[PDB]
Amino acid sequence: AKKILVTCALPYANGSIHLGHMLEHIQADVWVRYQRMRGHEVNFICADDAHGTPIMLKAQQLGITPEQMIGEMSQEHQTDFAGFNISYDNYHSTHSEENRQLSELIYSRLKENGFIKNRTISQLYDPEKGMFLPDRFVKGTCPKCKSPDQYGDNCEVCGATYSPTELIEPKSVVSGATPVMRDSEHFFFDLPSFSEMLQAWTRSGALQEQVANKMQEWFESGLQQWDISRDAPYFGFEIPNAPGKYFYVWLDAPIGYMGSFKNLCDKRGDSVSFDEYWKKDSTAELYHFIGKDIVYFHSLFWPAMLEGSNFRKPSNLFVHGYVTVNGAKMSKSRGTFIKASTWLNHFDADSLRYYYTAKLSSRIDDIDLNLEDFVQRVNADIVNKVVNLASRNAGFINKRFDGVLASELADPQLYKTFTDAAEVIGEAWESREFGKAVREIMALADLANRYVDEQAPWVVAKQEGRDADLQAICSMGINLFRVLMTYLKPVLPKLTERAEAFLNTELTWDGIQQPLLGHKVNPFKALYNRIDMRQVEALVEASK
């Protein structure tokens, strides 16, 4: 009966979805699907992060409007996520009217409350193009080793780091012009004002221990004010009362979580839910699934901005680690930098969903996709443990018993062992201990296959007068399958649909307390096929 708003980080609009994104969106989707199974009101919200200088420049290079460009990438992203069955209630954009109005509102409130500071800064400027240059749009000669054609604040030959103002013979990446230092007034959010509140949240015990520890490092270094403005030319929202100034993505990106929810409420004609979820007095829960690299932002800047503008703050942050492939960071040269779209040409979504889920936990630790292990694990667990219980038993039921399951459980004690596990497995899904949940489910699958082996239906089937025994054994196996697929429903949506078609019933969490007795099942082709290393080799080759 809880009200829950869950987000994933907003994908950047100038890059395709890859396996790293998928770790995050799959983790969130599994959790969301479980929460829905337990009867809660869930709103799963995301959007593309569509503003900024890189996006403006990319569109100019392509000779199209930034609006056309981000629209095309939004569609590409949503197609990929739909391919993996990520069950958003809304997927919006930071380039939207809802986000504009909320960004303006929040800024206005921050300013009225004394949290916006004005400061003049100096930055490299391209006088030919007529724009300030972000660091990575400045190139030149390393001041230390004198290597040419180095970009931004570091040299890829000697490893030195420096301000781009130290580059020798600097050039604009945009125009080739020599950049010069120029002053500009910027607006800053007074994050340090919120230090005590943030420190109290850190010690409150809600956050992951690893996150709280990192936060202590940040408090120790000392909180800084953060620039929330950019000069024209820009692709984004103009700041009221400040001609030629725009909101930097730091301000408008997370407000996209709010804008996406407002968009959903407005499309639904729901005039009460936005305030019910975002006002200070809210009894709804708000959760953000995010990666390591955006924790400072979500744990410090974001709750401060919300407090300073009279909105509720996150109930919790759920942080995951990086994805690796074959033990290492994704590598383009090795073909392990793998796009979501590419993945689906070779494998189904369920396979990756399962593999990631089996490795995930409540900690921040990197998650490794070892491709050899992926083949082994999917075949061993999905094909040979879980689906096996249906595939080894359904034929006899269909061919010899007209599709009808036995009128009573052959082994009620064993069935009770399976249903008794619901509390611990659900608690594991709830606490994000996904690996624990999968281990418990697979231990049950081992018990189920041990039961079938003990009963030896391939022997019973050939022996005169043992029809009743055969129906009993096979029906028991199918009932164990029903339970396991219920526990795995958040993980494997497509296999679940196929299982529900076979069983002639929707799988509900509470439904397992009533086994299927005197009940017609349907024939099926093949619920889940084996994979092989040849397919992996093809995936890698296609990714090079």
Residue 158 marked as a ligand binder = yes
Instruction: Give the SS3 label for residue 192.
Output: helix
Q: Does 168 bind Zn ion (CB under 5 A)?
A: no
Q: How crowded is residue 183: how many other Cβ atoms within 10 Å of its Cβ?
A: 10
CB of 14 to Zn ion, least distance (A): 28
CB of 145 to Zn ion, least distance (A): 3
Helix and strand totals (H; E) in the chain: 22, 16
**Per-residue contact flags (x/-) with Zn ion for residues 223 to 262, judged by CB under 5 A:** ----------------------------------------
Q: Does 167 bind Zn ion (CB under 5 A)?
A: no
Part in contact with Zn ion (CB under 5 A); list of ranges 72-80, 130-138, 146-154, 218-226: 146-154
C-alpha 371/C-alpha 348 separation (Å) is 15
Q: Does 145 bind Zn ion (CB under 5 A)?
A: yes
Residue 245 marked as a ligand binder = no
Q: Does 142 bind Zn ion (CB under 5 A)?
A: yes
Nearby residues of 518 by Cβ (< 8 Å), 6 or more positions away: 404, 405, 406, 407
CB of 148 to Zn ion, least distance (A): 10
Q: Which is nearer to Zn ion, 145 or 526 (CB)?
A: 145
CB of 141 to Zn ion, least distance (A): 9
Instruction: Give the SS3 label for residue 299.
Output: helix
Identify the residue among 4, 116, 131, 155 touching Zn ion (CB under 5 A). 155
Q: Which is nearer to Zn ion, 157 or 501 (CB)?
A: 157
Q: Which is nearer to Zn ion, 128 or 149 (CB)?
A: 149
Amino acid at 1: A
Q: Does 143 bind Zn ion (CB under 5 A)?
A: no
- Burial (0-12, 13-18, 19+ Cβ within 10 Å), 212: middle
Number of residues that bind Zn ion (CB under 5 A): 8
Q: Does 158 bind Zn ion (CB under 5 A)?
A: yes
**Residues 2, 40 contacting (CB under 8 angstroms):** yes
Q: Which is nearer to Zn ion, 145 or 180 (CB)?
A: 145
Q: Does 206 bind Zn ion (CB under 5 A)?
A: no
Q: Does 160 bind Zn ion (CB under 5 A)?
A: yes
> Residues 129-158, buried b or exposed e (16+ Cβ, 10 A)?
bebbbbeebbbbbbebeeeeebbbbebeee
Q: Does 144 bind Zn ion (CB under 5 A)?
A: yes
CB of 139 to Zn ion, least distance (A): 13
To which residue do tokens 């080739």 refer?
176
Residue from 251, 118, 116 nearest 184 by CA: 118
C-alpha 421/C-alpha 402 separation (Å) is 32
End-to-end CA distance of the chain: 48
Q: Which is nearer to Zn ion, 130 or 148 (CB)?
A: 148
Residue from 341, 351, 343, 339 nearest 376 by CA: 351
**Residues 226, 189 contacting (CB under 8 angstroms):** yes
CB of 150 to Zn ion, least distance (A): 6
Q: Which is nearer to Zn ion, 157 or 424 (CB)?
A: 157
Which residues contribute to the annotated binding site for Zn(2+)? Answer: 142, 145, 155, 158
Q: Which residues does the annotation place in the binding site for ATP?
A: 332
User: Which residue ranges are tagged as binding site?
Assistant: 142, 145, 155, 158, 332
Which residues contact Zn ion by CB under 5 A? 142, 144-145, 147, 155, 157-158, 160
